[PDB]
Amino acid sequence: KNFVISDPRLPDNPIIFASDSFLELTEYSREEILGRNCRFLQGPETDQATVQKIRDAIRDQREITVQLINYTKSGKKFWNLFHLQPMRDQKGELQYFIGVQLDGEFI
């Protein structure tokens, strides 16, 4: 499946794991993704109203589903439908965010 994990307990919430199909879809290698915030997939056509909603969901630690324009390494635009989900530990404390993508371009 197609997903990434970020660690919000590290500066600027970096990606610490990416599945192989996410690498294939974005055309990036694992070593140029790990340790970065996911926002590098954004570009000029990305809807800022939608980015705001993600920012608010991360702040409130709520699950959200969104669609937005992202860019592969070679600069190809694609519609990315991904669902964001908080992952808490046993004490109810936030540990990770997981982002699960539809394994292909969209409408």
Curated annotation (Swiss-Prot):
Residues 1-61 form the PAS domain. Disruption phenotype: Plants lacking both PHOT1 and PHOT2 have curled downward leaves missing color changes and lower petiole angles in response to weak or strong blue light (BL). Impaired proton H(+) pumping associated with altered increased ATP hydrolysis and absence of binding between 14-3-3 protein and H(+)-ATPase (e.g. AHA1 and AHA2) in response to BL in guard cells of plants missing PHOT1 and PHOT2. FMN 2 binds at N37, R39, Q42, R55, N70, N80, F82, Q101. The flavoproteins improved LOV (iLOVs) are fluorescent flavoproteins engineered from PHOT2 by improving its photostability and brighteness, and which maybe used as oxygen-independent fluorescent reporters with a small size. The iLOVs are PHOT2 fragments (385-496) and contain many amino-acid substitutions relative to cv. Columbia, to confer different properties in term of stablity, brightness and color. The modification S-4a-FMN cysteine is found at C38. Residues 62-104 form the PAC domain. Autophosphorylated in response to blue light irradiation. It is found in: Cell membrane. Transmembrane segments: none annotated. Expressed in leaves, stems and flowers, and to a lower extent in roots. Present in guard cells (at protein level). Induction: Light fluence rate-dependent induction, independent of light quality. Changing Q101K: Blue-shifted light absorption (maximum at 441 nm) and emitted fluorescence (487 nm). Red-shifted light emitted fluorescence (502 nm) but normal absorption (maximum at 447 nm). Coiled coil: none annotated. Undergoes a photocycle characterized by fluorescence and absorption changes induced by blue light. Half-time of photoproduct formation is 11 seconds and 15 seconds for dark regeneration. The activation loop within the kinase domain is the target of phosphorylation. The PAS (PER-ARNT-SIM) domains are required for the binding of FMN chromophores. Homodimer. Interacts with PKS1, PKS2, RPT3 and PHOT1. Associates with CBC1 and CBC2. Binds to BHP. Belongs to the protein kinase superfamily. AGC Ser/Thr protein kinase family. Protein kinase that acts as a blue light photoreceptor in a signal-transduction pathway for photo-induced movements. Triggers the phosphorylation of AHA1 and AHA2 C-terminal penultimate Thr in guard cells to activate them and induce stomatal opening in response to blue light (BL). Also phosphorylates BLUS1, a kinase involved in stomatal opening. Mediates calcium spiking of extra- and intracellular origins in response to blue light. Involved in hypocotyl phototropism. This is Phototropin-2. It comes from Arabidopsis thaliana (Mouse-ear cress). The gene is PHOT2. The chain holds residues 389 to 492 of 915 of the full protein.
